[PDB]
Amino acid sequence: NVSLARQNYADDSESAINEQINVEYNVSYVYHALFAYFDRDNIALKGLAKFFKESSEEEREHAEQLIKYQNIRGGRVVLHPITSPPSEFEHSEKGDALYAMELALSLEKLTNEKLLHVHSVADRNNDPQLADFIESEFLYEQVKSIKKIAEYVAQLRLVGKGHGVWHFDQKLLHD
Amino acid sequence: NVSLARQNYADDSESAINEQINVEYNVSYVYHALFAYFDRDNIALKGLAKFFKESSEEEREHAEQLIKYQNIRGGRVVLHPITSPPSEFEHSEKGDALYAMELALSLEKLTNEKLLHVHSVADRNNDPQLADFIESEFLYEQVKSIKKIAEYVAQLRLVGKGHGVWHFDQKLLHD
Amino acid sequence: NVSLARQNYADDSESAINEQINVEYNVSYVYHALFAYFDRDNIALKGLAKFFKESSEEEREHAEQLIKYQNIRGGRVVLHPITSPPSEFEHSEKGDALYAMELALSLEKLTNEKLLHVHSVADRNNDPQLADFIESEFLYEQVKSIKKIAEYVAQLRLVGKGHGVWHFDQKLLHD
Amino acid sequence: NVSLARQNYADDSESAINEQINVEYNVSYVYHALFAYFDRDNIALKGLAKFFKESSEEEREHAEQLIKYQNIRGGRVVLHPITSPPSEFEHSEKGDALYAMELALSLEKLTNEKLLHVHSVADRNNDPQLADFIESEFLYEQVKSIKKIAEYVAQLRLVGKGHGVWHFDQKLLHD
Amino acid sequence: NVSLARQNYADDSESAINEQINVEYNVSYVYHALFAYFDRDNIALKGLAKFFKESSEEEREHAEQLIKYQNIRGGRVVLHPITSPPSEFEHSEKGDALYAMELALSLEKLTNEKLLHVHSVADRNNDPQLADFIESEFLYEQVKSIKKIAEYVAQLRLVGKGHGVWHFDQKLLHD
Amino acid sequence: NVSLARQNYADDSESAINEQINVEYNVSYVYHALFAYFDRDNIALKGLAKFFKESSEEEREHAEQLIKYQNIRGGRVVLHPITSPPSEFEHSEKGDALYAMELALSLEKLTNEKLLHVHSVADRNNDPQLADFIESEFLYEQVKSIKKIAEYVAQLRLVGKGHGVWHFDQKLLHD
Ligand SMILES: [Mg+2]
Ligand SMILES: [Mg+2]
Ligand SMILES: [Mg+2]
Ligand SMILES: [Mg+2]
Ligand SMILES: [Mg+2]
Ligand SMILES: [Mg+2]
Ligand SMILES: [Mg+2]
Ligand SMILES: [Mg+2]
Ligand SMILES: [Mg+2]
Ligand SMILES: [Mg+2]
């Protein structure tokens, strides 16, 4: 029936973790839609495809880590529906590549906002282990990832459409 | 914005592949709910949890392989919603372990049924490349997986609840 | 009682596989009779003996693979009687060696005809996995084996009886 | 067309060796039916299946060794029909595993009885080479195999049906 | 003078294979004309030259594989004329590189159409071995090749004429 | 768009190189027809097949070297049609092997005559680099190949038909 491990773990904290699992899965799914777009033969931006596919795997790993954490604390994992992401990332004015990177950046900042919410739930329930788990396993990697993608945005704006985007994509491919 | 690779690839086949991606993703998600249940401290069947987690990873890799195939043929990948799986796999008369394994078996047979439909879609559109992709990459591995899981069901019925289930789980844990 | 794996597997397909198991065993047994003849001290064609003994092992391995396949699909293996092969392969006009190779060739073509029958049973029962299993695991190796033995027939006809047969046998021995 | 090697080798002994080849082949075939039964998905005793498959291979290698011996002595090898073995080894009161092992034990004792007759055939024809071939290559290995299988029968009676049988099977699987 | 191997091999299948051999040779020859053009000192696109030269060698290897297959099945190889390809691939609007890569794409799709025709001939003559040979040895490699070249077309359109084309060519050279 | 490398390179020399490219391709094609004949299951001369296959590859490599040379000198490669070779090489009185080796000898001496023509075109046009290219890259290998094949003709005449030809062929196979 009941968890024998659960201790100092509030219903609201359990719920916030189940919510964060769903955020990470949904963002993982959008990254996989981004991979599927740039992997098309008529788009053919293989570095962007690779980067978005690796980002999809990374976010799913975050989701799996939170599932494991939930059970460590004795909460119960509830897996919520995963929403259908858009399929098309065409943007004639910005170029598809810059538009996709700007969307990835907004994806990372949304994830960060959600993580900061989990942290506030932990603090208001006096759960220092949950607060530390979020800080040490997610918050620092999240701001590093935000800065990295913001740098890609800046570089894609600098090189311009056409040859420059293709070249930035080759740099992404071989990193 | 049109595929330059696409040839002899019907919209019928394109949609069946997008449906199969969704089937594999949903089955992967159910396997992750099964992992999350047996990973609970009060269930504590580590072999079952490991088997279902690795099954979840395998089904996700099937989805990603079909995504890449779609783009090879010049179809457009559409990622459909992933439905929320059940969280509870308690069953007093069968025991949780036998019940979960019988559910895994029906998951694999449902996947096989969907795969056989994709193959008939290929045949009816005279798409021998798609037919052979399904046969060579999925259909043989699928009947092997169904037999493996039916063997686990038989072994779980033989050893009985309690000590026997825990012992079967340890064997799974070390496979 | 009943197979839990069996799915899309017709009674006629199960029967055709049990029949093919018996074909492979019977051909394996005739190859072993061929080995036993050329291994006689007064025949003393050690390359032919070796080739026929390895062919006997190969065909028995085919029989064992079909037994395993039957259980993978959830059919029930029925092992039918194995017929007594002839013991003597003397042929004064052709020479024993050429006569035995021509018989091996007819053995391989009979096996091929039986395999093509299994395949037709699979197609008429809409069993694409069985059809692919036969194609990918048997049909290609079978035509390669038929061409190889036909080449031995042609070479044995070319070298002629006596010294030439003994020499061709030495070539077979060291391959 | 006559053997130049044959010496002190009675037709009595030649026929007894051809009979022993047939005994080993029939026992090998029964062991393969036992493999095919325990390899079923609803039986799923992998250790038993492996033991019986390796027993089938061992008995076939005995047949092939006797074929080679026949030709060493200058007898003519005759390969007799191999009879269809039973397919079903279900036994509610003993349990399938104990029943099958007791059948294996009687198979080995029947083989031993046949071997002892071949030895008496050698003795009554003053064929000390044949007698010593039987003693050195078969009779000691045969009593060792009978004792090993009688030990398996005793262990299967001790552990009882259900969990115990599955556990004994796992020990067999890792031997 | 007659094939002893030939079995279940229709005259129409033999002809379709001989036609496919000629298609592979003609495509190989056109690739060699593309190599000879981009290897000119005043064109000097080394990566495209290398790619077209390796494509010519691989298409010739396909022709040789089909020759060997014809003899495995016991048909007779007939080698037909290889027609003269164009020598000039100058295109002012598209640029030579994009024009040549679009031409390569249509050559691969033309080969694919002929392969699918051979497949249909095999199906119509109930030749599952020939159907499987085309599927497993040619059709999958062909769709991968078509996607690769369509990706090259997309990249050549993205980078534009002049510096971009030269840069894409360097990428192709070192891959 | 004109060659910037071309220097002291006469139109007649350019044309003689394009003619020689077509000579090597046609000879290569005939060697492939010889391979396809001796690769038949009812001919089964594996050494002759291997020799003619590698001769075909060698002559095609000569053609490609002449293509590269043409571009080094600034001429334009023109690829002419490749005529259809014979498919049958049966000769009852000589035997197929001796007849085919005598045909290869004629092929090599014809190629030699064409090369000596290219050399005389170079001399008439005071093109010492072309003359030296032909001398050092082709003429010496050509007389060595001619002597090699003449030696094969003499050995095939000496061993006679049947066992001798098969034996010579085995020697060729292991060279
Ligand atoms: Mg994350
Ligand atoms: Mg801290
Ligand atoms: Mg799957
Ligand atoms: Mg076989
Ligand atoms: Mg296939
Ligand atoms: Mg024995
Ligand atoms: Mg080439
Ligand atoms: Mg090709
Ligand atoms: Mg040459
Ligand atoms: Mg010189």
Side-chain angles (χ1 to χ4, degrees):
Chain A
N1 183 330
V2 61
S3 171
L4 300 184
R6 191 178 179 162
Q7 183 184 24
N8 193 38
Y9 198 55
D11 276 6
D12 286 347
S13 299
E14 177 185 34
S15 301
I17 286 292
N18 281 330
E19 288 172 30
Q20 190 66 28
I21 288 164
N22 193 248
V23 169
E24 303 284 346
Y25 267 133
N26 272 287
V27 171
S28 176
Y29 209 33
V30 179
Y31 273 128
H32 225 314
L34 283 167
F35 160 78
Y37 180 84
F38 288 94
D39 185 56
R40 293 177 182 181
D41 71 82
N42 58 293
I43 304 298
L45 288 170
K46 308 198 74 80
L48 279 150
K50 169 172 144 98
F51 173 74
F52 291 140
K53 168 164 266 275
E54 296 186 340
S55 299
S56 175
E57 169 166 86
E58 182 78 30
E59 227 62 50
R60 174 189 40 80
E61 289 176 352
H62 294 168
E64 282 157 29
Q65 189 171 5
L66 292 163
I67 289 169
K68 284 191 294 179
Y69 182 76
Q70 185 77 290
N71 281 332
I72 286 168
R73 294 299 303 276
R76 283 192 183 182
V77 177
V78 178
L79 295 174
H80 296 297
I82 303 176
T83 281
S84 179
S87 61
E88 312 308 303
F89 301 94
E90 186 179 33
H91 195 297
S92 47
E93 190 130 303
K94 289 177 174 181
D96 302 358
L98 174 60
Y99 172 62
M101 256 307 153
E102 292 182 349
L103 173 46
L105 177 67
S106 66
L107 253 32
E108 297 289 309
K109 292 174 103 172
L110 168 64
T111 301
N112 201 29
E113 171 199 304
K114 287 297 159 74
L115 287 165
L116 292 173
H117 170 70
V118 180
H119 192 276
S120 298
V121 173
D123 275 339
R124 73 182 64 142
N125 285 279
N126 194 28
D127 192 331
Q129 207 291 305
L130 170 60
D132 177 65
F133 179 73
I134 299 300
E135 288 164 12
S136 66
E137 290 278 356
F138 293 96
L139 287 193
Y140 196 29
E141 292 312 298
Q142 194 68 30
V143 296
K144 299 216 219 88
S145 158
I146 286 164
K147 198 225 178 185
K148 176 210 266 319
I149 294 168
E151 286 171 336
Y152 291 164
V153 172
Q155 293 172 69
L156 277 165
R157 294 178 172 183
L158 181 61
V159 297
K161 277 145 78 178
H163 185 8
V165 163
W166 178 88
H167 194 177
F168 172 87
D169 181 271
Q170 291 291 127
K171 164 245 194 288
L172 221 47
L173 184 63
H174 294 117
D175 281 2
Chain B
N1 58 349
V2 62
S3 167
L4 294 193
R6 190 170 185 164
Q7 181 184 23
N8 193 44
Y9 193 57
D11 287 331
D12 190 22
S13 303
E14 175 184 28
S15 300
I17 286 294
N18 281 334
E19 167 66 9
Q20 193 66 33
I21 294 163
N22 192 243
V23 170
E24 306 286 345
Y25 268 130
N26 276 288
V27 172
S28 175
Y29 207 35
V30 176
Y31 274 128
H32 229 139
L34 284 163
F35 161 74
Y37 180 84
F38 289 98
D39 188 54
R40 292 177 182 179
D41 70 82
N42 59 290
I43 307 298
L45 292 172
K46 306 293 238 170
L48 267 75
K50 183 162 94 71
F51 172 67
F52 291 139
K53 185 184 72 160
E54 286 177 4
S55 295
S56 182
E57 156 169 78
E58 173 87 1
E59 296 314 318
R60 181 191 41 82
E61 291 168 346
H62 293 167
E64 302 168 358
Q65 185 173 15
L66 290 157
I67 287 169
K68 276 149 77 171
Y69 182 77
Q70 184 79 283
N71 278 337
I72 285 169
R73 295 297 306 275
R76 306 313 201 194
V77 176
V78 186
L79 300 175
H80 296 304
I82 303 171
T83 62
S84 177
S87 62
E88 308 309 304
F89 303 94
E90 180 168 340
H91 195 296
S92 292
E93 313 75 350
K94 292 170 175 297
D96 306 359
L98 174 60
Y99 175 64
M101 201 54 91
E102 292 182 353
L103 164 64
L105 178 58
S106 67
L107 284 175
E108 297 286 309
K109 284 179 119 172
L110 166 143
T111 301
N112 197 30
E113 182 172 89
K114 290 288 193 138
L115 285 168
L116 295 167
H117 177 70
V118 177
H119 191 278
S120 74
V121 171
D123 274 340
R124 74 190 185 191
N125 293 283
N126 295 288
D127 193 334
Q129 209 290 300
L130 172 59
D132 181 65
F133 180 73
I134 297 302
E135 299 164 356
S136 293
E137 296 298 325
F138 291 94
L139 292 192
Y140 196 29
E141 299 304 298
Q142 195 65 44
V143 295
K144 251 116 91 307
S145 158
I146 285 161
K147 198 224 171 179
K148 183 182 66 188
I149 292 180
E151 288 172 336
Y152 290 163
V153 167
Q155 291 173 67
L156 278 165
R157 301 175 166 185
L158 181 61
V159 300
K161 286 143 93 186
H163 187 6
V165 163
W166 176 92
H167 192 177
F168 173 84
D169 183 271
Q170 291 289 315
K171 162 265 202 305
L172 227 41
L173 184 61
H174 298 321
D175 274 2
Chain C
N1 183 330
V2 61
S3 171
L4 300 184
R6 191 178 179 162
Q7 183 184 24
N8 193 38
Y9 198 55
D11 276 6
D12 286 347
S13 299
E14 177 185 34
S15 301
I17 286 292
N18 281 330
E19 288 172 30
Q20 190 66 28
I21 288 164
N22 193 248
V23 169
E24 303 284 346
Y25 267 133
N26 272 287
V27 171
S28 176
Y29 209 33
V30 179
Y31 273 128
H32 225 314
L34 283 167
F35 160 78
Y37 180 84
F38 288 94
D39 185 56
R40 293 177 182 181
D41 71 82
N42 58 293
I43 304 298
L45 288 170
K46 308 198 74 80
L48 279 150
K50 169 172 144 98
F51 173 74
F52 291 140
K53 168 164 266 275
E54 296 186 340
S55 299
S56 175
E57 169 166 86
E58 182 78 30
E59 227 62 50
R60 174 189 40 80
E61 289 176 352
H62 294 168
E64 282 157 29
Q65 189 171 5
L66 292 163
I67 289 169
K68 284 191 294 179
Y69 182 76
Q70 185 77 290
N71 281 332
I72 286 168
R73 294 299 303 276
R76 283 192 183 182
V77 177
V78 178
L79 295 174
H80 296 297
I82 303 176
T83 281
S84 179
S87 61
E88 312 308 303
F89 301 94
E90 186 179 33
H91 195 297
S92 47
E93 190 130 303
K94 289 177 174 181
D96 302 358
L98 174 60
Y99 172 62
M101 256 307 153
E102 292 182 349
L103 173 46
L105 177 67
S106 66
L107 253 32
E108 297 288 309
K109 292 174 103 172
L110 168 64
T111 301
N112 201 29
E113 171 199 304
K114 287 297 159 74
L115 287 165
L116 292 173
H117 170 70
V118 180
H119 192 276
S120 298
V121 173
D123 275 339
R124 73 182 64 142
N125 285 279
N126 194 28
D127 192 331
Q129 207 291 305
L130 170 60
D132 177 65
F133 179 73
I134 299 300
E135 288 164 12
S136 66
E137 290 278 356
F138 293 96
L139 287 193
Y140 196 29
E141 292 312 298
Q142 194 68 30
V143 296
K144 299 216 219 88
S145 158
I146 286 164
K147 198 225 178 185
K148 176 210 266 319
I149 294 168
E151 286 171 336
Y152 291 164
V153 172
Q155 293 172 69
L156 277 165
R157 294 178 172 183
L158 181 61
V159 297
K161 277 145 78 178
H163 185 8
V165 163
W166 178 88
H167 194 177
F168 172 87
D169 181 271
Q170 291 291 127
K171 164 245 194 288
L172 221 47
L173 184 63
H174 294 117
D175 281 2
Chain D
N1 58 349
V2 62
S3 167
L4 294 193
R6 190 170 185 164
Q7 181 184 23
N8 193 44
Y9 193 57
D11 287 331
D12 190 22
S13 303
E14 175 184 28
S15 300
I17 286 294
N18 281 334
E19 167 66 9
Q20 193 66 33
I21 294 163
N22 192 243
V23 170
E24 306 286 345
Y25 268 130
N26 276 288
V27 172
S28 175
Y29 207 35
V30 176
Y31 274 128
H32 229 139
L34 284 163
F35 161 74
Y37 180 84
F38 289 98
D39 188 54
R40 292 177 182 179
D41 70 82
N42 59 290
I43 307 298
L45 292 172
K46 306 293 238 170
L48 267 75
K50 183 162 94 71
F51 172 67
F52 291 139
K53 185 184 72 160
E54 286 177 4
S55 295
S56 182
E57 156 169 78
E58 173 87 1
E59 296 314 318
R60 181 191 41 82
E61 291 168 346
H62 293 167
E64 302 168 358
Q65 185 173 15
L66 290 157
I67 287 169
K68 276 149 77 171
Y69 182 77
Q70 184 79 283
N71 278 337
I72 285 169
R73 295 297 306 275
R76 306 313 201 194
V77 176
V78 186
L79 300 175
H80 296 304
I82 303 171
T83 62
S84 177
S87 62
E88 308 309 304
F89 303 94
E90 180 168 340
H91 195 296
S92 292
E93 313 75 350
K94 292 170 175 297
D96 306 359
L98 174 60
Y99 175 64
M101 201 54 91
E102 292 182 353
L103 164 64
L105 178 58
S106 67
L107 284 175
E108 297 286 309
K109 284 179 119 172
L110 166 143
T111 301
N112 197 30
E113 182 172 89
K114 290 288 193 138
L115 285 168
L116 295 167
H117 177 70
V118 177
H119 191 278
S120 74
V121 171
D123 274 340
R124 74 190 185 191
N125 293 283
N126 295 288
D127 193 334
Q129 209 290 300
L130 172 59
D132 181 65
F133 180 73
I134 297 302
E135 299 164 356
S136 293
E137 296 298 325
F138 291 94
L139 292 192
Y140 196 29
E141 299 304 298
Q142 195 65 44
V143 295
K144 251 116 91 307
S145 158
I146 285 161
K147 198 224 171 179
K148 183 182 66 188
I149 292 180
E151 288 172 336
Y152 290 163
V153 167
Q155 291 173 67
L156 278 165
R157 301 175 166 185
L158 181 61
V159 300
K161 286 143 93 186
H163 187 6
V165 163
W166 176 92
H167 192 177
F168 173 84
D169 183 271
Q170 291 289 315
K171 162 265 202 305
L172 227 41
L173 184 61
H174 298 321
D175 274 2
Chain E
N1 64 114
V2 76
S3 171
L4 301 192
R6 192 176 180 159
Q7 177 181 33
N8 195 38
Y9 197 55
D11 285 347
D12 283 348
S13 300
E14 180 184 26
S15 304
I17 285 299
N18 279 331
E19 304 162 344
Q20 194 62 30
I21 291 162
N22 191 248
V23 169
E24 301 289 347
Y25 272 129
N26 275 279
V27 170
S28 175
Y29 209 31
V30 175
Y31 273 128
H32 237 173
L34 288 162
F35 161 71
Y37 182 83
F38 288 93
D39 187 56
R40 289 178 185 179
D41 73 84
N42 56 293
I43 302 301
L45 288 174
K46 292 276 186 202
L48 277 94
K50 172 180 141 116
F51 171 71
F52 292 140
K53 162 129 72 63
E54 294 184 344
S55 299
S56 175
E57 171 157 20
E58 172 122 10
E59 300 303 330
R60 173 191 51 68
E61 286 174 4
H62 293 170
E64 187 175 294
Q65 188 173 3
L66 287 165
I67 288 166
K68 270 140 63 173
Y69 182 77
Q70 185 78 281
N71 282 337
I72 287 168
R73 290 303 300 275
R76 272 44 163 116
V77 178
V78 180
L79 296 182
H80 290 284
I82 299 169
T83 78
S84 180
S87 65
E88 312 306 308
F89 303 93
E90 179 175 30
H91 195 293
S92 57
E93 317 92 82
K94 291 168 175 295
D96 301 3
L98 174 60
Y99 175 69
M101 201 58 77
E102 288 182 358
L103 173 55
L105 178 58
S106 49
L107 288 167
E108 300 290 310
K109 290 199 187 182
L110 166 68
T111 305
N112 200 26
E113 172 196 88
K114 291 286 186 299
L115 288 170
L116 295 168
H117 167 72
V118 182
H119 199 275
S120 297
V121 168
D123 268 338
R124 293 197 228 105
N125 289 277
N126 308 296
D127 188 333
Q129 208 293 300
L130 171 57
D132 178 72
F133 179 75
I134 297 295
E135 288 166 13
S136 65
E137 298 293 327
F138 288 99
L139 289 192
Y140 197 23
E141 301 294 312
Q142 195 68 35
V143 291
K144 287 177 174 157
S145 169
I146 285 160
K147 198 221 180 184
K148 186 223 301 175
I149 294 183
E151 285 175 334
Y152 289 163
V153 170
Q155 295 170 66
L156 277 163
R157 292 172 177 187
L158 185 59
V159 297
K161 269 132 68 172
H163 183 190
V165 164
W166 178 88
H167 191 359
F168 172 85
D169 178 90
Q170 292 294 129
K171 177 259 168 165
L172 201 51
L173 177 68
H174 298 299
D175 308 340
Chain F
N1 201 216
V2 68
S3 172
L4 297 186
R6 187 176 181 162
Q7 180 178 27
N8 194 38
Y9 197 52
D11 275 353
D12 286 350
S13 300
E14 175 184 36
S15 308
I17 287 296
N18 281 329
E19 290 163 11
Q20 191 65 29
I21 291 162
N22 189 250
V23 170
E24 305 284 340
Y25 271 136
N26 278 288
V27 174
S28 174
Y29 211 29
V30 172
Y31 272 132
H32 234 173
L34 284 160
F35 159 75
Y37 182 83
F38 291 94
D39 186 54
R40 288 172 187 185
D41 70 82
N42 57 286
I43 303 296
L45 290 170
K46 306 297 243 163
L48 250 61
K50 178 169 94 71
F51 174 71
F52 293 135
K53 162 156 295 193
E54 284 168 11
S55 296
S56 176
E57 176 163 60
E58 182 79 3
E59 300 305 320
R60 176 205 35 100
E61 272 161 16
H62 292 168
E64 314 208 2
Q65 181 169 16
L66 291 163
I67 289 167
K68 262 131 71 168
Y69 180 81
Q70 183 77 286
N71 281 335
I72 287 165
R73 294 298 308 274
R76 311 306 205 197
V77 178
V78 184
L79 300 173
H80 299 287
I82 304 178
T83 191
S84 178
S87 71
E88 307 307 307
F89 299 95
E90 185 175 17
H91 203 289
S92 52
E93 60 152 42
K94 291 179 169 149
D96 300 2
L98 174 59
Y99 169 76
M101 203 57 76
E102 292 180 352
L103 173 58
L105 181 54
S106 306
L107 294 179
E108 298 295 306
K109 296 177 107 172
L110 186 275
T111 299
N112 197 32
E113 186 176 298
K114 292 299 186 178
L115 288 171
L116 294 167
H117 167 70
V118 181
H119 189 277
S120 81
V121 171
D123 275 331
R124 278 194 286 272
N125 288 282
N126 202 23
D127 189 339
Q129 210 292 304
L130 171 58
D132 178 64
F133 180 74
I134 296 298
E135 287 165 16
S136 68
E137 287 312 301
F138 290 99
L139 292 191
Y140 194 32
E141 307 289 292
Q142 200 65 32
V143 293
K144 262 138 65 173
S145 163
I146 284 165
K147 198 228 179 181
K148 182 198 199 60
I149 293 184
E151 288 172 329
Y152 289 166
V153 165
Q155 294 171 61
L156 280 162
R157 295 180 172 185
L158 178 65
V159 299
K161 285 142 89 174
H163 186 189
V165 162
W166 178 91
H167 194 177
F168 173 86
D169 181 87
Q170 290 293 308
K171 166 258 200 293
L172 213 43
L173 181 60
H174 300 103
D175 264 355

